[PDB]
C-alpha cells in the first residue's frame, strides 16, 4: 500500500471530501507518520518479537570525508559522513548499513556512546562502524585507511519518521518517485487497522468541533460559535 | 518534526485559528515544553530503558576562566565556566560534554556534590569534570593546568526545558536558525501523540470557558458571562 491509499482511507472514514475542510491531508500525513512510530514502539519494545519486512525502509546515502573537529594536524583521524542528515532509527528492528548489496559487506551500525571506543581489538581493526551523531549526520569510523574511499551506502532500518526516510529512498529501477503519495507506506498490514482507527479517533472529535467563525475582534469559542 | 508542526497540530486540534483567540501559540509552546519533560520523566525514571536519539539536544558553550571566589591568592584554584547559564539536564539519559567531536575526548559530566571531591586518585588527575553550579553556569574542574586552555565545548543531554536548549544550539552547516519555530522539537515520535493529547486535554476545557467580558467595574464570572 502507498501513502495515498492510507491517507484517503482516513479521509473517507472521516468524510473530509470537500476542498473547504479544516483538516487537510497534511494533518492526515502527520498523524499517520506519528501513530506509525507510536504503534511500532508499543508492539516491539516490550519483549523481542519478529519484525516483518514491511516496517523497514532503505534510505540511500552519499559519504564524504570530514575532519574530526577541524583541519588541524592533532585533532585526530578523519571520518566519513553522509552528505545529508539521516533519520533517527527506532531501537526495535535490525538496523543495517550495506554497500548496495544487502547480502554482502560488514558495516556495523552501533550506538553513539559505543563508537567513542571501537576497534581496539586487533581482530576488529578492519570493521567499519556507523552511528548517527547529535549533528544529525551518519558518521563512519574505522582503523583501516581503506574505509575513506567508501563513496555510497544504503541504510535499511525501521526509521522513526517514515516521511523523512521516504524522501531519501534509493532510485527504483523505473526511476525516482517525486510524489510522496505514490511511495509505499512502511508498516505491516496487520497494524494498518489499528493505525487507521487511532487516527480517525484522533480527528473525529475535532472534526465536529466549533470554530471562532465570526470576524469581530472577539473570541467566539466560549459561545460555541 | 519542528516546533511549528507540533504547535499547529495542537492549535488545529483545538481549532484556535482566528487571531482573536484567547489561547495564543505561546500558551501552546509553554504547555508542549512542560509536558515533554513530564512525559520524559514518566517514561524514563521508573526503570532504566533505552532513550532514543530524538530526546537529546546539543547546546554549544564558550568557556571562560573564572576565580573560585574572587581574585585572592588563597581562595583556591580557578575554574572554567560557560559564559551563559546552562539548562538543567534531566537525570534519565546520557549527559555528555564533548570537544566538538562526540566520538572523541573525555570530559565528565557529574553531580555538583561529587565534584566537590574529584581527582584525588592519581590516575584520575587528568580528567576534566563538569557540573552545573547553583549559579546556573556549567563549571569545569581538573587538577591538570592544561584544562584552562579549553575554549569551546558542546553539551549533549536530555535538557529539562527544550526551549532554553534550542536557543543555544550550535550553528548548523547552513547557519543559525533564528526562529524557534523552524528548529526541531526534541522528542521521539512514539511520544508525540501522548504529548499532543495531553496538551489538547489541558486546553480543551479552558477553550470554551466563560470570560469576564463586560467592562463594568465588576466581576462577571459567577454569572457565567
Amino acid at each position: 500500500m502507498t501513502y495515498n491509499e492510507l491517507i484517503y482511507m482516513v479521509l473517507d472514514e472521516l468524510k473530509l471530501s470537500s476542498d473547504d475542510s479544516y483538516y487537510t491531508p497534511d494533518h492526515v500525513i502527520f498523524l499517520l507518520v506519528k501513530y506509525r512510530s507510536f504503534l511500532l514502539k508499543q508492539r516491539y519494545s516490550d519483549i523481542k518479537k519478529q519484525i516483518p519486512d514491511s516496517d523497514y525502509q532503505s534510505i540511500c546515502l552519499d559519504l564524504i570525508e570530514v575532519p574530526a573537529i577541524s583541519g588541524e594536524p592533532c585533532e585526530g583521524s578523519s571520518y566519513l559522513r553522509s552528505k545529508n542528515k539521516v533519520p533517527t532509527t527506532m531501537m526495535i528492528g535490525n538496523p543495517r548499513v550495506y554497500p548496495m548489496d544487502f547480502y554482502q559487506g560488514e558495516i556495523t551500525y552501533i550506538s553513539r556512546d559505543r563508537m567513542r571506543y571501537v576497534g581496539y581489538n586487533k581482530f576488529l581493526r578492519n570493521i567499519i562502524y556507523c552511528s548517527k551523531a547529535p549533528d544529525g549526520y551518519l558518521y563512519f569510523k574505522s582503523w583501516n585507511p581503506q574505509f575513506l574511499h567508501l563513496e555510497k551506502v544504503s541504510f535499511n532500518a525501521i526509521f522513526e519518521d517514515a516521511k523523512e526516510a521516504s524522501e531519501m529512498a534509493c532510485p527504483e529501477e523505473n526511476g525516482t518517485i517525486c510524489k510522496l503519495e505514490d511511495k509505499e507506506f512502511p508498516i505491516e498490514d496487520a497494524l494498518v487497522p489499528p493505525l487507521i482507527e487511532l487516527v480517525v479517533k484522533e480527528l473525529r472529535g475535532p472534526e465536529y468541533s466549533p470554530k471562532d467563525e465570526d470576524n469581530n475582534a472577539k473570541d467566539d469559542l466560549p459561545d460555541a460559535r | 518534526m519542528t516546533y511549528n508542526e507540533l504547535i499547529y497540530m495542537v492549535l488545529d486540534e483545538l481549532k484556535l485559528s482566528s487571531d482573536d483567540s484567547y489561547y495564543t501559540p505561546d500558551h501552546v509552546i509553554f504547555l508542549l515544553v512542560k509536558y515533554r519533560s513530564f512525559l520524559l520523566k514518566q517514561r524514563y525514571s521508573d526503570i532504566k530503558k533505552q532513550i532514543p536519539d530524538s530526546d537529546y539536544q546539543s547546546i554549544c558553550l564558550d568557556l571562560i576562566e573564572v576565580p573560585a571566589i574572587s581574585g585572592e591568592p588563597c581562595e583556591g584554584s580557578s575554574y572554567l565556566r560557560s559564559k551563559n547559564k546552562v539548562p538543567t539536564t534531566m537525570m534519565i539519559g546520557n549527559p555528555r560534554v564533548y570537544p566538538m567531536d562526540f566520538y572523541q575526548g573525555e570530559i565528565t559530566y557529574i553531580s555538583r556534590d561529587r565534584m566537590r571531591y574529584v581527582g584525588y586518585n592519581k590516575f584520575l588527575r587528568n580528567i576534566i569534570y563538569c557540573s552545573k553550579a547553583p549559579d546556573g553556569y556549567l563549571y569545569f574542574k581538573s587538577w591538570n593546568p592544561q584544562f584552562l586552555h579549553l575554549e569551546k565545548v558542546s553539551f549533549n543531554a536530555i535538557f529539562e526545558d527544550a526551549k532554553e536548549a534550542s536557543e543555544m544550539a550550535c550553528p548548523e552547516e547552513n547557519g543559525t536558525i533564528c526562529k524557534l519555530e523552524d528548529k526541531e522539537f526534541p522528542i521521539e515520535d512514539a511520544l508525540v501523540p501522548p504529548l499532543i493529547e495531553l496538551v489538547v486535554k489541558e486546553l480543551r476545557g479552558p477553550e470554551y470557558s466563560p470570560k469576564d467580558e463586560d467592562n463594568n467595574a465588576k466581576d462577571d464570572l459567577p454569572d457565567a458571562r
Binding site: 507510536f38 516490550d46 482507527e197 487511532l198 472529535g205 | 501522548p194 499532543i196 495531553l198 489538547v200 480543551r204
Partner: peptide, 28 residues
C-alpha cells in the same frame, strides 16, 4: 471527543504486566 494515545498505551501496559506475570509462573 476522543483520542486513544494514552488509553491505548495504558491498556497495552496492563496487558504486558499480566503477560510478565503469566510467563514468570512458567517453569521447566
Amino acid at each position: 471527543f476522543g483520542s486513544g494515545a494514552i488509553g491505548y498505551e495504558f491498556d497495552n501496559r496492563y496487558l504486558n504486566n499480566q503477560e510478565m506475570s503469566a510467563v514468570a509462573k512458567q517453569r521447566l
